[PDB]
Design an enzyme around this catalytic site. Structure first.
Site, PDB file in Angstrom:
ATOM      1  N   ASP D  45       0.864  -1.143  -0.147  1.00  0.00           N
ATOM      2  CA  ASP D  45      -0.017  -0.131   0.046  1.00  0.00           C
ATOM      3  C   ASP D  45       0.867   1.237  -0.158  1.00  0.00           C
ATOM      4  N   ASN D 119      -5.907   7.957   1.729  1.00  0.00           N
ATOM      5  CA  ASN D 119      -6.275   7.137   3.156  1.00  0.00           C
ATOM      6  C   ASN D 119      -6.690   8.342   3.969  1.00  0.00           C
ATOM      7  N   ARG D 145      -8.876  19.376  22.653  1.00  0.00           N
ATOM      8  CA  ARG D 145      -7.644  19.400  23.277  1.00  0.00           C
ATOM      9  C   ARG D 145      -7.166  17.917  23.355  1.00  0.00           C
ATOM     10  N   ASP D 147      -4.363  14.835  21.297  1.00  0.00           N
ATOM     11  CA  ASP D 147      -3.016  14.750  20.566  1.00  0.00           C
ATOM     12  C   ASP D 147      -3.175  15.134  19.089  1.00  0.00           C
ATOM     13  N   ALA D 159      -7.537   1.886   7.405  1.00  0.00           N
ATOM     14  CA  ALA D 159      -6.307   2.207   7.825  1.00  0.00           C
ATOM     15  C   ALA D 159      -6.134   2.806   9.128  1.00  0.00           C
ATOM     16  N   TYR D 160      -5.427   4.137   8.896  1.00  0.00           N
ATOM     17  CA  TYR D 160      -5.298   4.810  10.306  1.00  0.00           C
ATOM     18  C   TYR D 160      -6.582   4.932  11.177  1.00  0.00           C
ATOM     19  N   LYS D 162      -9.058   3.324  11.528  1.00  0.00           N
ATOM     20  CA  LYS D 162      -9.700   1.912  12.086  1.00  0.00           C
ATOM     21  C   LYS D 162      -9.130   1.910  13.370  1.00  0.00           C
ATOM     22  N   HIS D 220       1.094   8.910   3.431  1.00  0.00           N
ATOM     23  CA  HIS D 220       2.540   8.787   4.012  1.00  0.00           C
ATOM     24  C   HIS D 220       3.456  10.278   4.334  1.00  0.00           C
TER      25      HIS D 220
HETATM   26  C1  LIG Z   1       3.046   3.354  10.778  1.00  0.00           C
HETATM   27  C2  LIG Z   1       1.888   2.201  10.886  1.00  0.00           C
HETATM   28  N1  LIG Z   1       1.348   2.153   9.430  1.00  0.00           N
HETATM   29  C3  LIG Z   1       1.519   1.193   9.047  1.00  0.00           C
HETATM   30  O1  LIG Z   1       2.443   0.307   9.133  1.00  0.00           O
HETATM   31  N2  LIG Z   1       0.915   0.977   7.722  1.00  0.00           N
HETATM   32  C4  LIG Z   1       0.956   0.060   6.745  1.00  0.00           C
HETATM   33  C5  LIG Z   1      -0.082  -0.948   7.324  1.00  0.00           C
HETATM   34  O2  LIG Z   1      -1.002  -0.046   6.598  1.00  0.00           O
HETATM   35  C6  LIG Z   1      -1.666  -0.953   5.687  1.00  0.00           C
HETATM   36  N3  LIG Z   1      -2.468  -0.017   5.071  1.00  0.00           N
HETATM   37  C7  LIG Z   1      -2.606   0.963   4.540  1.00  0.00           C
HETATM   38  C8  LIG Z   1      -1.368   1.625   4.480  1.00  0.00           C
HETATM   39  C9  LIG Z   1      -0.217   2.288   4.139  1.00  0.00           C
HETATM   40  C10 LIG Z   1       1.129   2.661   3.986  1.00  0.00           C
HETATM   41  O3  LIG Z   1       1.200   4.124   4.579  1.00  0.00           O
HETATM   42  C11 LIG Z   1       1.189   4.556   6.034  1.00  0.00           C
HETATM   43  C12 LIG Z   1      -0.351   4.553   6.348  1.00  0.00           C
HETATM   44  O4  LIG Z   1      -0.234   4.332   7.696  1.00  0.00           O
HETATM   45  C13 LIG Z   1      -1.230   4.184   8.296  1.00  0.00           C
HETATM   46  N4  LIG Z   1      -1.138   4.315   9.732  1.00  0.00           N
HETATM   47  C14 LIG Z   1      -0.190   5.199  10.228  1.00  0.00           C
HETATM   48  N5  LIG Z   1      -0.407   5.073  11.357  1.00  0.00           N
HETATM   49  C15 LIG Z   1      -1.196   4.331  11.871  1.00  0.00           C
HETATM   50  C16 LIG Z   1      -1.387   3.619  12.743  1.00  0.00           C
HETATM   51  N6  LIG Z   1      -0.974   3.983  13.974  1.00  0.00           N
HETATM   52  N7  LIG Z   1      -2.299   2.593  12.885  1.00  0.00           N
HETATM   53  C17 LIG Z   1      -2.587   2.185  11.743  1.00  0.00           C
HETATM   54  N8  LIG Z   1      -2.449   2.570  10.584  1.00  0.00           N
HETATM   55  C18 LIG Z   1      -1.678   3.790  10.590  1.00  0.00           C
HETATM   56  C19 LIG Z   1      -2.073   5.453   7.435  1.00  0.00           C
HETATM   57  O5  LIG Z   1      -3.154   5.277   7.177  1.00  0.00           O
HETATM   58  C20 LIG Z   1      -1.094   6.100   6.649  1.00  0.00           C
HETATM   59  O6  LIG Z   1      -1.759   6.467   5.449  1.00  0.00           O
HETATM   60  N9  LIG Z   1      -3.559   1.329   4.005  1.00  0.00           N
HETATM   61  C21 LIG Z   1      -4.543   0.538   4.455  1.00  0.00           C
HETATM   62  C22 LIG Z   1      -5.843   0.408   4.183  1.00  0.00           C
HETATM   63  N10 LIG Z   1      -6.304   1.402   3.594  1.00  0.00           N
HETATM   64  N11 LIG Z   1      -6.580  -0.653   4.720  1.00  0.00           N
HETATM   65  C23 LIG Z   1      -5.720  -1.362   5.137  1.00  0.00           C
HETATM   66  N12 LIG Z   1      -4.429  -1.359   5.618  1.00  0.00           N
HETATM   67  C24 LIG Z   1      -3.820  -0.417   4.989  1.00  0.00           C
HETATM   68  C25 LIG Z   1      -0.681  -1.299   4.971  1.00  0.00           C
HETATM   69  O7  LIG Z   1      -0.786  -2.322   4.152  1.00  0.00           O
HETATM   70  C26 LIG Z   1       0.282  -1.855   6.220  1.00  0.00           C
HETATM   71  O8  LIG Z   1      -0.210  -3.073   6.579  1.00  0.00           O
HETATM   72  C1  LIG Z   2      -1.953  18.166  26.600  1.00  0.00           C
HETATM   73  C2  LIG Z   2      -3.116  17.851  27.275  1.00  0.00           C
HETATM   74  N1  LIG Z   2      -2.723  17.661  28.350  1.00  0.00           N
HETATM   75  C3  LIG Z   2      -3.300  18.556  29.273  1.00  0.00           C
HETATM   76  O1  LIG Z   2      -4.019  19.605  28.861  1.00  0.00           O
HETATM   77  N2  LIG Z   2      -3.009  18.436  30.399  1.00  0.00           N
HETATM   78  C4  LIG Z   2      -3.672  19.477  31.573  1.00  0.00           C
HETATM   79  C5  LIG Z   2      -4.692  18.608  32.244  1.00  0.00           C
HETATM   80  O2  LIG Z   2      -4.285  17.588  32.655  1.00  0.00           O
HETATM   81  C6  LIG Z   2      -4.865  17.430  33.949  1.00  0.00           C
HETATM   82  N3  LIG Z   2      -4.214  16.458  34.607  1.00  0.00           N
HETATM   83  C7  LIG Z   2      -3.116  16.354  34.729  1.00  0.00           C
HETATM   84  C8  LIG Z   2      -1.812  17.127  34.467  1.00  0.00           C
HETATM   85  C9  LIG Z   2      -1.003  17.780  33.986  1.00  0.00           C
HETATM   86  C10 LIG Z   2      -0.065  18.860  33.242  1.00  0.00           C
HETATM   87  O3  LIG Z   2       1.011  18.166  32.724  1.00  0.00           O
HETATM   88  C11 LIG Z   2       0.745  17.542  31.201  1.00  0.00           C
HETATM   89  C12 LIG Z   2       0.105  16.007  31.521  1.00  0.00           C
HETATM   90  O4  LIG Z   2      -0.542  16.233  30.384  1.00  0.00           O
HETATM   91  C13 LIG Z   2      -1.318  14.876  30.336  1.00  0.00           C
HETATM   92  N4  LIG Z   2      -1.881  14.815  29.097  1.00  0.00           N
HETATM   93  C14 LIG Z   2      -0.919  14.769  28.083  1.00  0.00           C
HETATM   94  N5  LIG Z   2      -1.468  14.474  26.772  1.00  0.00           N
HETATM   95  C15 LIG Z   2      -2.531  14.326  27.383  1.00  0.00           C
HETATM   96  C16 LIG Z   2      -3.918  13.946  26.408  1.00  0.00           C
HETATM   97  N6  LIG Z   2      -3.777  13.704  25.180  1.00  0.00           N
HETATM   98  N7  LIG Z   2      -4.925  13.765  27.232  1.00  0.00           N
HETATM   99  C17 LIG Z   2      -4.815  13.858  28.305  1.00  0.00           C
HETATM  100  N8  LIG Z   2      -3.896  14.348  29.139  1.00  0.00           N
HETATM  101  C18 LIG Z   2      -2.827  14.360  28.491  1.00  0.00           C
HETATM  102  C19 LIG Z   2      -0.229  14.015  30.668  1.00  0.00           C
HETATM  103  O5  LIG Z   2      -0.767  13.360  31.862  1.00  0.00           O
HETATM  104  C20 LIG Z   2       1.034  14.721  31.020  1.00  0.00           C
HETATM  105  O6  LIG Z   2       1.412  14.492  32.353  1.00  0.00           O
HETATM  106  N9  LIG Z   2      -2.788  15.431  35.616  1.00  0.00           N
HETATM  107  C21 LIG Z   2      -4.046  14.880  36.040  1.00  0.00           C
HETATM  108  C22 LIG Z   2      -4.424  13.804  36.747  1.00  0.00           C
HETATM  109  N10 LIG Z   2      -3.572  13.147  37.334  1.00  0.00           N
HETATM  110  N11 LIG Z   2      -5.457  13.746  36.604  1.00  0.00           N
HETATM  111  C23 LIG Z   2      -6.313  14.403  36.209  1.00  0.00           C
HETATM  112  N12 LIG Z   2      -6.004  15.383  35.601  1.00  0.00           N
HETATM  113  C24 LIG Z   2      -4.732  15.636  35.246  1.00  0.00           C
HETATM  114  C25 LIG Z   2      -4.534  19.076  34.373  1.00  0.00           C
HETATM  115  O7  LIG Z   2      -5.111  19.507  35.365  1.00  0.00           O
HETATM  116  C26 LIG Z   2      -4.824  19.596  33.047  1.00  0.00           C
HETATM  117  O8  LIG Z   2      -6.618  19.758  33.146  1.00  0.00           O
END
Ligand SMILES: CCNC(=O)NC[C@H]1O[C@@H](n2c(C#CCOC[C@H]3O[C@@H](n4cnc5c(N)ncnc54)[C@H](O)[C@@H]3O)nc3c(N)ncnc32)[C@H](O)[C@@H]1O
Ligand SMILES: CCNC(=O)NC[C@H]1O[C@@H](n2c(C#CCOC[C@H]3O[C@@H](n4cnc5c(N)ncnc54)[C@H](O)[C@@H]3O)nc3c(N)ncnc32)[C@H](O)[C@@H]1O
Ligand SMILES: CCNC(=O)NC[C@H]1O[C@@H](n2c(C#CCOC[C@H]3O[C@@H](n4cnc5c(N)ncnc54)[C@H](O)[C@@H]3O)nc3c(N)ncnc32)[C@H](O)[C@@H]1O
Ligand SMILES: CCNC(=O)NC[C@H]1O[C@@H](n2c(C#CCOC[C@H]3O[C@@H](n4cnc5c(N)ncnc54)[C@H](O)[C@@H]3O)nc3c(N)ncnc32)[C@H](O)[C@@H]1O
Lengths: 261, 261, 261, 261
Positions: D45, D119, D145, D147, D159-160, D162, D220
């Site tokens: 792919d 994708n 708020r 990732d 893909a991703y 799923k 990609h």
């Molecule tokens: C890094 C981890 N990825 C992989 O290893 N990919 C490869 C696996 O994906 C399968 N595959 C691809 C594709 C492709 C290559 O390009 C990268 C693509 O990677 C994917 N991707 C990114 N992060 C991901 C994540 N965390 N989990 C799951 N998938 C993620 C994103 O869609 C991005 O477009 N398309 C598909 C599809 N339509 N249906 C089923 N499988 C697919 C492919 O055959 C292989 O098995």
């Molecule tokens: C970027 C998005 N984060 C935030 O905005 N954080 C702040 C929010 O977190 C609350 N909080 C914190 C903490 C802290 C500050 O430090 C960063 C921390 O951020 C967290 N973090 C990272 N990515 C994350 C994500 N995707 N989703 C959820 N949380 C994530 C990771 O634990 C990392 O340690 N501790 C806690 C806790 N024990 N229990 C409940 N709430 C908490 C806090 O009061 C505030 O509300």
């Protein structure tokens, strides 16, 4: 009793810090940020996380207290209006100490770097696919292909671990929880999916398969590590001590933060 | 040493049971299914769950051994081809006992019924909406509106708890895990969503709000209860003892059942 | 224009219904609950679901209007205070009609029963394990082992489908979504896990493997069916028509119900 | 008929490419990688994703064909052993074309960059917290708020999308699906959580709140964008055309990739 106060740096926190220092001047309290025994954090969990890592070298000599002037403040026990009551009770000397488990991360190259975490430690690749072999107590368990992994402490299970689907763990349980970050699962790739809760003395080891560069996080820190041979997770023997003045159960602390307050 | 053997009832298991009984006749072994000290289950986890509940009155006097003649067999430690080696080692007398935590369910009416669970206990409504208030250590935590709830033991976290999104818990941790069954969450209804892991001495209480009839399950059993005042969850003081002859770690047991074997 | 009004039956709704009937008496409106062209539901989504199924025989001749006197009211467009403005505009005759897709369920024995659903149709076993083979367009897709399955309409994706992890589907898309209810996945059992979105003209067929008795639901109804040969899902050719007087986009309707209002 | 062949670059694929080129030399086939009408991808792919983006300027003049010499190959229709049968049928001229929907991403600064995705397109912050306002058809829907976010095409839902919990969408549905990447939800922060399926002509706009630097991915590719005013998602009017020689339904393609084969 020696103490120090760290502040978020905004107007409300800096002023609250000066008032407490002036209030502590009316008791047998000495301000010492080198060897304090009470560390007071004024701000949020981020301010509290920084206070912990600022003094991780003397966690056995320090009790932490959190005042939240911000939005949530999960680790805090105090409103700013209750501050002068905190000065008095902390001066009265009688309060009870509670201890939460901590996580230990050991990273190896080709030296050895260790870290202590209050919330969690996470691994991601330094750009490119993240592939590691998961070894539990020297037995290979799975090959993880995805965005990353998150190993959480009990008190950290309500943080990043919660957003990844993990379970909420009461901090009397000495454990660590590992959760996945968007693993790929198909005919060729297979992971457990479910979060894993490991007890004490259990060693989780991550071993690289291709790329050896990973972006490792410890709470708010995020480091890039090169030439990585192994990342190792383990329940620390060190614990963080909290000074408690009233009853605030962990489950009620959970209710206020997520249900309503 | 007194022992008994229960069997799935199919041809392969019944014959395997007769061969072991004949094999045990060559040692100082006495068949007694009233007061056995070794309980051998030939079949699957369902056969093993039945053997446990058949002897829940003497769990402190009994060590369990599982032979799986079926598909998965999570609680089993033996293939049918390894059976004659099991007769010998069990006769040799030397093996080590490992203990898994159990769950206690207490149901109250308006008497009091208690149950012991190896996998989990679940609550659902007797037709109609399922609404209960969740009380943790006498503090109200949430009002649950959904299909039901599942409280799991550690060794039971790989079963029903796993399919509901729960975490996998090593059985050295004395805990219980509560998971949700399709809760409704909107502007009016709000639950924690995340699974909850409770330690020992923590009491989870479910309290009805409208309907007081619930279908309560304990492992494979499913009972209808009427006029329910309270359902109470708690880590039991009783534990189940396993007779182990080789090393089969829980995490390796997890790997074989879900990754590959 | 012929119309009828159904009511939740509580005091606020019954009185509101009488006021509108008196208000409609000042226009060229005739109350007819046998052959209405406007069906007004006063209550909640449950009251609205009942009004739909009360008139599923003339969905092509009927436009529905919802007034919510309850908690959420997802299908409603009106507050009770805005009721007299609704009488006037509906009398003015000018409003626009919007159509949502419906689900068709066909159940076969050994005759043939069909049903129309506005939210979803779900299958569960009549006590005991639920096992069915999932056949998509005459090609076998998977064997499902779990608690059940849920096939949802677009407008129903915000209901039961949402609590099962399903996606939210805009009702301009003529589709149906199938979600799982706690499937078991291990070395022996494997399902897709992910929800599936099927277009028009795609036929999903469930085929029993062991037990042939299933508790089938259509919205708030729950029926027991015996000697089942096949359950068949399909996007209906019939649609439900809504009378709209202002703009209330589906996504804004989603925001108010789940984010805040 | 003009054609070109791209290869993964390993030994098996390069040799297979030379054999087909030699085989095509026995027909009225001309190799042209500047203006081909048939694009054949030999690899996985990833190799197929690269072939698509290599020729995104003439997607209306090109039909794609995938041969997988690798592990999964979701977009492929051919084993390497079936290659010479593909040369013949493609030379015979008769095959049917199927079209999958594509995603359009428009990024704005302070010019305007557009992208086509097969994708998905995902957004993450350039280090630091990721916060954006989600605007659907000029109506603010939520503040995210977490990732990041992932907007997927139908064929990209396997893909991703799923791995993030999204639903699987049949490619006859002209739609795009938006999924979350570990959003934070508490008393202060609230998102929909559920995946969202948008039809054609629906415009999803992401608007920065604090940081204006985001790492945007298209399949990609992964780009860093600075001074971002708006990221806009939309179902493209352009589609990708596949040359099909036998029946391989999307759901059977799903079954082989995830259930068994
Ligand atoms: C890094 C981890 N990825 C992989 O290893 N990919 C490869 C696996 O994906 C399968 N595959 C691809 C594709 C492709 C290559 O390009 C990268 C693509 O990677 C994917 N991707 C990114 N992060 C991901 C994540 N965390 N989990 C799951 N998938 C993620 C994103 O869609 C991005 O477009 N398309 C598909 C599809 N339509 N249906 C089923 N499988 C697919 C492919 O055959 C292989 O098995
Ligand atoms: C970027 C998005 N984060 C935030 O905005 N954080 C702040 C929010 O977190 C609350 N909080 C914190 C903490 C802290 C500050 O430090 C960063 C921390 O951020 C967290 N973090 C990272 N990515 C994350 C994500 N995707 N989703 C959820 N949380 C994530 C990771 O634990 C990392 O340690 N501790 C806690 C806790 N024990 N229990 C409940 N709430 C908490 C806090 O009061 C505030 O509300
Ligand atoms: C109806 C669908 N069940 C099954 O088919 N079960 C059998 C499968 O369970 C495996 N197995 C059993 C057990 C047992 C037998 O007793 C019934 C148990 O059924 C479970 N159960 C109920 N509903 C469930 C659901 N929806 N999804 C998942 N599991 C569910 C409940 O735990 C209940 O205690 N224990 C375990 C275990 N510790 N770890 C791993 N696998 C186990 C066992 O080997 C077999 O593979
Ligand atoms: C028993 C728990 N249900 C409820 O309390 N329902 C009422 C709540 O549903 C809201 N509501 C209804 C509806 C309706 C009434 O009919 C019963 C329906 O109940 C649902 N349902 C069944 N079990 C469920 C479960 N476990 N979780 C979530 N929903 C479940 C099934 O869709 C079944 O059709 N439609 C919708 C809708 N389109 N969008 C948003 N909200 C809706 C409604 O306003 C109210 O808030």
């Amino acid at each position: 009793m020696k103490y120090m106060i760290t502040s978020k740096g905004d107007e409300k926190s800096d002023l609250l810090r000066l008032n407490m220092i002036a209030g502590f001047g009316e008791y047998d309290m000495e301000y010492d940020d080198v060897e304090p025994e009470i560390v007071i954090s004024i701000g949020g969990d981020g301010t509290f996380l920084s206070a912990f890592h600022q003094y991780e070298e003397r966690l056995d000599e320090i009790a932490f207290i959190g005042i939240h002037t911000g939005h949530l403040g999960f680790y805090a026990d105090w409103r700013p209006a209750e501050a002068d009551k905190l000065v008095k009770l902390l001066a009265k000397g009688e309060y009870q100490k509670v201890s939460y488990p901590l996580l230990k991360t050991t990273v190896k190259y080709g030296k050895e770097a260790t870290y202590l975490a209050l919330n969690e430690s996470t691994v991601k690749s330094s750009g490119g696919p993240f592939v590691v072999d998961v070894v539990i107590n020297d037995i290979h368990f799975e090959r993880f292909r995805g965005d990353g992994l998150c190993m959480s402490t009990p008190s950290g299970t309500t943080a990043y671990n919660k957003s990844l689907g993990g379970a909420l763990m009461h901090p009397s349980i000495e454990a660590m929880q590992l959760t996945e970050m968007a693993s790929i699962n198909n005919r060729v790739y297979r992971t457990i999916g479910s979060p894993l809760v490991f007890p004490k003395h259990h060693v989780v080891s991550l071993q690289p398969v291709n790329d050896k560069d990973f972006q490792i996080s410890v709470d708010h820190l995020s480091i890039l590590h090169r030439d990585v041979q192994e990342i190792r997770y383990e329940v620390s023997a060190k614990k963080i001590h909290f000074a408690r003045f009233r009853s605030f159960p962990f489950w009620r602390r959970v209710h206020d933060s997520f249900i309503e307050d």
